[PDB]
Amino acid sequence: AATFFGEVVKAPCRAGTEDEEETPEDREVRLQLARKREVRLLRRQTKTSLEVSLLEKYPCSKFIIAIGNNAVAFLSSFVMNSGVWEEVGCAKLWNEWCRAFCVFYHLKSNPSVFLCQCSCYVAEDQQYQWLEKVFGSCPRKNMQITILTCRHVTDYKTSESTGSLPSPFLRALKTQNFKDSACCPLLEQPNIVHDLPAAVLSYCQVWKIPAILYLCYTDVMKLDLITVEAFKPILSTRSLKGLVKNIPQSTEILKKLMTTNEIQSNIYT
Amino acid sequence: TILAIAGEDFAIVASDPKCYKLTDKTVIGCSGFHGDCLTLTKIIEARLKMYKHSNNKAMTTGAIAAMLSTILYSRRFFPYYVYNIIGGLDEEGKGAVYSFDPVGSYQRDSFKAGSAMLQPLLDNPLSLDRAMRLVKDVFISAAELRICIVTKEGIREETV
Amino acid sequence: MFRNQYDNDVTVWSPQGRIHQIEYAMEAVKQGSATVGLKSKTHAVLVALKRAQSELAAHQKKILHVDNHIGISIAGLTADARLLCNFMRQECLDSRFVFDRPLPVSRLVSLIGSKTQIPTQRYGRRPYGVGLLIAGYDDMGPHIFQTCPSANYFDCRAMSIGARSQSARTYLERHMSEFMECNLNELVKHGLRALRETLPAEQDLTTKNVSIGIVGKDLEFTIYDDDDVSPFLEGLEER
Amino acid sequence: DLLRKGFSCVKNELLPSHPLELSEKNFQLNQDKMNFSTLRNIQGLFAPLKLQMEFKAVQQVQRLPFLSSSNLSLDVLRGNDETIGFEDILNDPSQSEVMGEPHLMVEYKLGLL
Amino acid sequence: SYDRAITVFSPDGHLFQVEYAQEAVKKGSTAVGVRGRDIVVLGVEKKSVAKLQDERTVRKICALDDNVCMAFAGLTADARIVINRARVECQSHRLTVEDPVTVEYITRYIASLKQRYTQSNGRRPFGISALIVGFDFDGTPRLYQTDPSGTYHAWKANAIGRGAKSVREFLEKNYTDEAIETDDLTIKLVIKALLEVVQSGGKNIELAVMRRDQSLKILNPEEIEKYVAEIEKEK
Amino acid sequence: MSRGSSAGFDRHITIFSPEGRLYQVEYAFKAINQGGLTSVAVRGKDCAVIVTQKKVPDKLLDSSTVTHLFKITENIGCVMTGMTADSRSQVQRARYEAANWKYKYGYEIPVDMLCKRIADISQVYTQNAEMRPLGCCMILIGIDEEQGPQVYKCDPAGYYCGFKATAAGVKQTESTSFLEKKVKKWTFEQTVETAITCLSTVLSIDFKPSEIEVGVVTVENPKFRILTEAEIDAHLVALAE
Amino acid sequence: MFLTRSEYDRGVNTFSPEGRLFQVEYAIEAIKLGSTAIGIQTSEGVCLAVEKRITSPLMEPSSIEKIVEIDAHIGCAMSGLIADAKTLIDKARVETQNHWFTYNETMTVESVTQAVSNLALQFGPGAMSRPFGVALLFGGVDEKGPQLFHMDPSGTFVQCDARAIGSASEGAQSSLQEVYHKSMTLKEAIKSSLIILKQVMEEKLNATNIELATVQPGQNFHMFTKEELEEVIKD
Amino acid sequence: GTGYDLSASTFSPDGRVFQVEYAMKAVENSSTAIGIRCKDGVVFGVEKLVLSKLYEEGSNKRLFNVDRHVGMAVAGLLADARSLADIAREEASNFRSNFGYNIPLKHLADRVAMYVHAYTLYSAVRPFGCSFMLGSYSVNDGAQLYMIDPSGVSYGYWGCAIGKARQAAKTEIEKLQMKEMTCRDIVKEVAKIIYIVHDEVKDKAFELELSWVGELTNGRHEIVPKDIREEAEKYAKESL
Amino acid sequence: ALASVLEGTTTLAFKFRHGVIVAADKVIEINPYLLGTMAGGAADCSFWERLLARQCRIYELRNKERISVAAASKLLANMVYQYKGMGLSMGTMICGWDKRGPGLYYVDSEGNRISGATFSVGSGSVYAYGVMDRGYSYDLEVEQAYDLARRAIYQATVNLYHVREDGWIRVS
Structure with a gap:
């Protein structure tokens, strides 16, 4: 961080105490910036917006959340291939890293089953606004929450080198009220998870709601077949039992999706 | 002595001096000081390899002639002592022969030589057999041994 | 949690006695497609797996050309690969021009290692982020080498690098016994069979994402693409 | 170009006017080369490397090139702090009769021109 | 925290120091230029009078050659270098x-010189913006602007x-072919555009002009007052 | 360098403390004691003597390769205290400077001139942001043509002076007090005995012939010479009896 | 088990714990602030289309050159910062003239793209310390058929058949994949490109806010005029 | 020493440079190499861990040759060791060119040690992370062995051992009669020591690599013949 | 790593209201709009006119406008003048029609650069210059000018070109 010869530089701080502590124009610019980064819940199908929190206007018995492109692809291929689902609303965000973008559906046969698909990035100052908009302040007593997320294998902590692990693999973390069991070993001791899934799990734990979070550790973070297929053991759990009916159709849809992914960059060859 | 004759479908280059092959459709003939000739041939080979790597394509005859002219004129105040003749199949079936000077000015022609007037043999067209016979017979008629015919098939190694 | 101060520079030693930037650079080789190389008593071949961003694009070049008897395959960054290829071409051309004798592969690899070691010790630079497989033929017979971002080279005999190369490496280790007494057709067949292990068990090794480079005693370096790889592929069995 | 430079003859730049011109213009470089060669042949590679590193580090803290500098540490390291030559008393560079624009000389020092 | x-x-994907230099330019003094049929007009508005000052030493309109002139707005010290460089380059x-x-x-040379100073951490950009008008060798008026x-x-x-936003809006609304026909019309247009933002005119306006094969001419307070009074007479 | 400078009143060599103290120089001074040995130099009427400790703790080492007495020139001897690599590098630099002075002026460099040149070189390291001071101190002895024996010393701060009897290492203060007590109240045999007795009294060791090494210069023989085991043992026996 | 802060994207020579030089990715992301450019090559010529996005009616339209002339048979496009593309186009023109002077031959499109890319891959005297924030799109005819290429801030080029660079790259590429055919003529390509442009742009597509150019195998580079744009849009 | 260990030109409050200490700690991340000097020669021995069966027999060699009379064994970072070997070759070749005869080992050790130490002074470079040994034999000088440290200090040794487990290796080396044995027994003793010090749980498998220079080789560095190596391995395994 | 840290020919030409006409008994085609004449060393003429042609092409590409005859002649004179006294030998006439009417210039190796209306160099060119001066005018006929050039060549004793507002053509 030295520009010329002999400049005095200070080492960075890992605790984030470098902001120190320290006019109406300042208030105006702060308010403008705050309004530029405000989470808003809208009903995409006509209308303009919404008034009351999403779960405070409907009854719920199961909630499934997907974060990342791989989990969204998994649920699209394996769960949404059958039945009819009606979109309820979408979320509008703005970060330095963003801009299915946080779109909510529910089963028509069972109006008490909800599914979410967030493929965007939510900054650390928009987690609690997202929680307030989606859940609210009067949580229901009887709910089930399943969360899916993908993380890079270099974030794992092991006695051996991280390149020796047989990736991909699954890990779990569940609330004390989760009377069921998991299909994968629980996360080890010196490992932590942050961001949106951590926020949802913390909310569920604090307000005494059963919940479970699944993590997939992969060496490739793009749309790859192996990463999506690594989620298969979840299909045998009681959480997703009456939602999966046809496997070969899901495999064919997955093949088509893997054919039509996206355009790529030209950095790595 | 260096003698080069063009043709309707092939280029005839002969010598008794040395003749070198640059590609499948070009033959270079040099004379004069040996060290300068060797250095010029090495430079030509190196730049030919560089162009082949850069453009992923072999050099044609006209491009070789232009590059050689630029190389020759690069050192004008300390000129070389060489005489170069380029002959080969240029683009699409026409024999092309190029003449040079020690300073680096070139022009295209049909008959060029390097041993005085070399029996020009007015009039005579000039098929491969007749041209080869005339080229062989000029030296023995003068009475004062290698032929490298270039064609679409390839380059031969005729000897006398 | 204590790594924050000791991993922003390549001229800083960690309290455990490690340099983390070298390992981070080594992590970049696994960002590219898998490539496979193997040799026999007479020939050395290189097999790569091309990858296109989408349907309306042409697959990028993974096998380059250095000299009449040396060819390489790349995996990792692209600018570093181009710079290294330029250096190798310049060295080979200079040696040929001066000594009128081809530059030996061992000397080339030693020069590459010596050049690559430098930016891992001084300030203002970063390690190269590309791994190479070099195949050549000289007076000592066929050769095959590997290059690491940590300025290390190994004189292997059958190696594969890139993303998800463990299966190919296992297959090569299993079948390395019967490689010396083979000719070109079954050598290329073994290479393709080893490379096929990388793909998931739903795809196929079609004639649109395969590049082959072959060098030998009387045969110069040659690259086959598109319809040129058809004669090398009909004999393969099913999965 | 053609106004920032002029009155230059190519044929009058290849041939030096006096036998002593080049030797006087490049005395320090030749002296350093001789000293470094002798030191490297006697002791090893490390001594010239250390000397060059010290010279480079010292020479990097000076005034901008449109103002005269003193060069004290460099003279201490070289040993010219107790010797006076003809370069010190003749044609004093602190009272030069010509000088260019500041920004242009600073840019030329960096090599952007 | 990337600035x-x-x-x-x-x-x-933002470079912020260049935008901060643009912000520094944004706080200068208004300068307006209009390209006419056979004339080019420039004009700037004057800051605090500073009655005990010599007005000759402070001007924001300069001549680069016999057919090119320039006006600027931003940091005053930085423009004096670019002007001399352009004068030498001509x-x-x-x-x-x-x-x-x-x-x-x-204009391209000035832009390249400005660009050279935004390529390293050892030097800072030039915080000025320029308006260049003149006549080509074919007699065609021109007007450019750099950043x-x-x-x-x-x-x-x-x-x-x-x-500048209000001045540009006024120019967009009131610029046409019926108010560019004559040099007097062009000068009145420029004066009105300057008056749209400045205080009581005639004492806070500096205006120059250049015709074809006539070199730069600086208008005097008498002529400026005459033009202002003529405008005032027109309801 | 592009590494910048650390922030703090210490932690950099070109930063002044609120009352003008350079702390990196004092830390370099503290670095001398890292070796754990002590050196003593005493100047006699017509001779100079250098005595230093020797410590080999490993039976797998070669005792002939462990030494701290160097020979800068045929008439100049040195003893170094501090880091071993830094001491050897500074010895090489001193040899180069002596050769350069000989070439430039035509006669052998004097001890004071050599010490002044070394100190002048060392002073530059404390003003720039690139180099760091060496953690060692050098003691030089020699015979002058017209002045006699001479003892000098240099320190990492760039300060040099001439003494009558000095010491360096870890017991410098006690050795200095003993030397003042002795001087306030000398042939060749008395100087060696005085130095050995000073070291033995300060360290409370009762040395054996294989734990010390001695180098002397005299007017009759002005060449730096390292004493041998037999001579050291003879001196120790004479001192004991 | 604590959570802390780590930074890996404040320097060009810093590797993230998974490779991933982030400054190059940020430079690539900086392309999205430009204007959409569409280029597709066919059996009888290559087409290039780009929007202008004029900021004010007082600006002269014939000054925003989003399509330039590298040589008599090679085009180019624009996306990102304008100042960098100028110093890349200058290199392209100088190289393509030097090749002719040396060999009496026309440079290959691939060769000129490689020569351009040899300059933008080196960073970190006159070389910059940051990646170029621009993406180019070459095209033209040669001894082979029509050819189209691409280039991004990382400095590496790839041959292609249908590209879309700018703000609406994703949607434009999706539409191009849906519509493109192996062998069409220079009317369906024009119609599809104009339709996609009119869809992606928020404003109405008139005859002045866009720009078009073609390079047919027989003729040299030719740029459509206002009447040609009007008659194409009307159809 | 936190706060004073980010550069090689910074002193701790107690007067010590910590980057050098980290560099010397980095050498215990590799395997163990030992060297024993005997009555009429010097014998080397290293423990090499096999990474895979694909590498050719003779890859990642850790026993180099400087010239026809000097051996070398390394430990630590491999690239730094290769660079130092190249520097040593250059120094020896230059000395031979100028003076016309073989370079003594002490001067070569001094030159290489000073070159290594030169990287300890500046903040623009990084200290080396490898330590090595040298050995030779002459009729009028006998056996000679030396050590080099990442800090830049050199010494002469009778028996030396560097790497992960230098302490135990030295412990078993000290109970030997170096001065009254030939190479024939020293090779077996070295093999036994290497087999004793090796740990089986952490490292999967390893292959030996032995060499000597001495009188019976006419002062030339060479690889042990295969039969002698096999019998030494058998002796070590039987004794273990 | 540490070491890396440190570092027999007759020609004539004339112009009038309807362009420029050049005649000879060689002539280099610099550009579709600029035409040149060779006199002296062949290699020097070829190389230097090729350099001028490429530089004019670069200028036209940069400025999106054709160069002017005066600028091209001045550029060629400046480029030649640098290697003065080195043995270069050339005499050239630059003819073209850009703006403000046609222009004709002369430039040689020494450094001369003269703008005139009639030019003729080489061997017995004095007779040609005399006859053309006798038959010179400003308002004439194209056929009359061709006949005058032919008569001048015949008296001096064929290559003929004409430069118009949109390029040059060869008639014989």
Whole structure:
């Protein structure tokens, strides 16, 4: 961080105490910036917006959340291939890293089953606004929450080198009220998870709601077949039992999706 | 002595001096000081390899002639002592022969030589057999041994 | 949690006695497609797996050309690969021009290692982020080498690098016994069979994402693409 | 170009006017080369490397090139702090009769021109 | 927190020090230029009077050659370097070519010089913006403008400095072919555009003019007052 | 360098403390004691003597390769205290400077001139932001043509002076007090005995012939010479009896 | 088990714990602030289309050159910062003239793209310390058929058949994949490109806010005029 | 020493440079190499861990040759060791060119040690992370062995051992009669020591690599013949 | 790593209201709009006119406008003047029609650069210059000018070109 010869530089701080502590124009610019980064819940199908929190206007018995492109692809291929689902609303965000973008559906046969698909990035100052908009302040007593997320294998902590692990693999973390069991070993001791899934799990734990979070550790973070297929053991759990009916159709849809992914960059060859 | 004759479908280059092959459709003939000739041939080979790597394509005859002219004129105040003749199949079936000077000015022609007037043999067209016979017979008629015919098939190694 | 101060520079030693930037650079080789190389008593071949961003694009070049008897395959960054290829071409051309004798592969690899070691010790630079497989033929017979971002080279005999190369490496280790007494057709067949292990068990090794480079005693370096790889592929069995 | 430079003859730049011109213009470089060669042949590679590193580090803290500098540490390291030559008393560079624009000389020092 | 280095990109792809230089330009003094049929007009608004000052030593309109002139707005010290560099370059090109310089050529040179100083962390950009008008060798009027980033464009009329949005809106509303026909009409248009933002005119306006093959001319307070009174008479 | 400078009143060599103290120089001074040995130099009427400790703790080492007495020139001897690599590098630099002075002026460099040149070189390291001071101190002895024996010393701060009897290492203060007590109240045999007795009294060791090494210069023989085991043992026996 | 802060994207020579030089990715992201450019090559010529996005009616339209002339048979496109593309186009033109002077031959499109890319891959005297924030799109005819290429801030080029660079790259590429055919003529390509442009742009597509150019195998580079744009849009 | 260990030109409050200490700690991340000097020669021995069966027999060699009379064994970072070997070759070749005869080992050790130490002074470079040994034999000088440290200090040794487990290796080396044995027994003793010090749980498998220079080789560095190596391995395994 | 840290020919030409006409008994085609004449060393003429042609092409590409005859002649004179006294030998006439009417210039190796209306160099060119001066005018006929050039060549004793507002053509 030295520009010329002999400049005095200070080492960075890992605790984030470098902001120190320290006019109406300042208030105006702060308010403008705050309004530029405000989470808003809208009903995409006509209308303009919404008034009351999403779960405070409907009854719920199961909630499934997907974060990342791989989990969204998994649920699209394996769960949404059958039945009819009606979109309820979408979320509008703005970060330095963003801009299915946080779109909510529910089963028509069972109006008490909800599914979410967030493929965007939510900054650390928009987690609690997202929680307030989606859940609210009067949580229901009887709910089930399943969360899916993908993380890079270099974030794992092991006695051996991280390149020796047989990736991909699954890990779990569940609330004390989760009377069921998991299909994968629980996360080890010196490992932590942050961001949106951590926020949802913390909310569920604090307000005494059963919940479970699944993590997939992969060496490739793009749309790859192996990463999506690594989620298969979840299909045998009681959480997703009456939602999966046809496997070969899901495999064919997955093949088509893997054919039509996206355009790529030209950095790595 | 260096003698080069063009043709309707092939280029005839002969010598008794040395003749070198640059590609499948070009033959270079040099004379004069040996060290300068060797250095010029090495430079030509190196730049030919560089162009082949850069453009992923072999050099044609006209491009070789232009590059050689630029190389020759690069050192004008300390000129070389060489005489170069380029002959080969240029683009699409026409024999092309190029003449040079020690300073680096070139022009295209049909008959060029390097041993005085070399029996020009007015009039005579000039098929491969007749041209080869005339080229062989000029030296023995003068009475004062290698032929490298270039064609679409390839380059031969005729000897006398 | 204590790594924050000791991993922003390549001229800083960690309290455990490690340099983390070298390992981070080594992590970049696994960002590219898998490539496979193997040799026999007479020939050395290189097999790569091309990858296109989408349907309306042409697959990028993974096998380059250095000299009449040396060819390489790349995996990792692209600018570093181009710079290294330029250096190798310049060295080979200079040696040929001066000594009128081809530059030996061992000397080339030693020069590459010596050049690559430098930016891992001084300030203002970063390690190269590309791994190479070099195949050549000289007076000592066929050769095959590997290059690491940590300025290390190994004189292997059958190696594969890139993303998800463990299966190919296992297959090569299993079948390395019967490689010396083979000719070109079954050598290329073994290479393709080893490379096929990388793909998931739903795809196929079609004639649109395969590049082959072959060098030998009387045969110069040659690259086959598109319809040129058809004669090398009909004999393969099913999965 | 053609106004920032002029009155230059190519044929009058290849041939030096006096036998002593080049030797006087490049005395320090030749002296350093001789000293470094002798030191490297006697002791090893490390001594010239250390000397060059010290010279480079010292020479990097000076005034901008449109103002005269003193060069004290460099003279201490070289040993010219107790010797006076003809370069010190003749044609004093602190009272030069010509000088260019500041920004242009600073840019030329960096090599952007 | 990505705005403390010149050559550092933002996560959304922004270079912020150049934008801060543009912000520094934004707080200068208004300068307006209009390109006419057979004339070009420039004009700036004066700051605090400072009655005990010599007005000759402070001017914001300069002549680069016999057919090019320039106005600026931003930092005062930085413009004095670019002006001298352009003045030297004009004569250098005259030696090189024997033809008088082109407005586009001199604008491109100035833009390149400005761009050179936004490529390293050891130097800071020039916080000025320029308006260049002149006549080509074919007798065609021109008008250009540069930015601290190093980009230039060709305009019919525009304005820079503080309070430029209202001036540009007025110019857009009131610029046409019926008010450009005569030199007097063009000068009245420029004066009105300047009056749209300045206080009581006639004492806070500096205006210049250049016709074809006539060199730069600086209008005097008597003529400025005459034009202002003529405008005032027109309801 | 592009590494910048650390922030703090210590932690950099070109930063002044609120009352003008350079702390990196004092830390370099503290670095001398890292070796753990002590050196003593005493100047006699017509001779100079250098005595230093020797410590080999490993039976797998070669005792002939462990030494701290160097020979800068045929008439100049040195003893180094501090880091071993730094001491050897500074010895090489001193040899180069002596050769350069000989070439430039035509006669052998004097001890004071050599010490002054070394100190002048060392002073530059404390003003720039690139180099760091060496953690060692050098003691030089020699015979002058017209002045006699001479003892000098240099320190990492760039300060040099001439003494009558000095010491360096870890017991410098006690050795200095003993030397003042002795001087306030000398042939060749008395100087060696005085130095050995000073070291033995300060360290409370009762040395054996294989734990010390001695180098002397005299007017009759002005060449630096390292004493041998037999001579050291003879001196120790004479001192004991 | 604590959570802390780590930074890996404030320097060009810093590797993230998974490779991933982030400054290059940020430079690539900086392309999205430009204007959409569409280029597709066919059996009888290559087409290039790009929007202008004029900021004010007072600006002269014939000054925002989003399509330039590298040589008599090679085009180019624009996306990102304007100042950098100028110093890349200058290199392209100088190289393509030097090749002719040396060999009496026309440079290959691939060769000129490689020569251009050899300059933008080196960073970190006159070389910059940051990646170029621009993406180019070459095209033209040669001894082979029509050819189309691409280039991004990382400095590496790839041959292609249908590209879309700018703000609406994703949607434009999706539409191009849906519509493109192996062998069409220079009317369906034009119609599809104009339709996609009119869809992606928020404003109405008139005859002045866009720009078009073609390179047929027989003729040299030719740029459509206002009447040609009007008659194409009307159809 | 936190706060004073980010550069090689910074002193701790107690007067010590910590980057050098980290560099010397980095050498215990590799395997163990030992060297024993005997009555009429010097014998080397290293423990090499096999990474895979694909590498050719003779890859990642850790026993180099400087010239026809000097051996070398390394430990630590491999690239730094290769660079130092190249520097040593250059120094020896230059000395031979100038003076016309073989370079003594002490001067070569001094030159290489000073070159290594030169990287300890500046903040623009990084200290080396490898330590090595040298050995030779002459009729009028006998056996000679030396050590080099990442800090830049050199010494002469009778028996030396560097790497992960230098302490135990030295412990078993000290109970030997170096001065009254030939190479024939020293090779077996070295093999036994290497087999004793090796740990089986952490490292999967390893292959030996032995060499000597001495009188019976006419002062030339060479690889042990295969039969002698096999019998030494058998002796070590039987004794273990 | 540490070491890396440190570092027999007759020609004539004339112009009038309807362009420029050049005649000879070689002539280099610099550009579709600029035409040149060779006199002296062949290699020097070829190389230097090729360099001028490429530089004019670069200028036209940069400025999106054709160069002027005066600028091209001045550029060629400046480029030649640098290597003065080195043995270069050339005499050239630059003819073209850009703006303000046609222009004709002469430039040689020494450094001369003269703008005139009639030019003729080489061997017995004095008779040609005399006859053309006798038959010179400003308002004439194209066929009359061709006949005058032919008569001048015949008296001096064929290559003939004409430069118009949109390029040059060869008639014989």
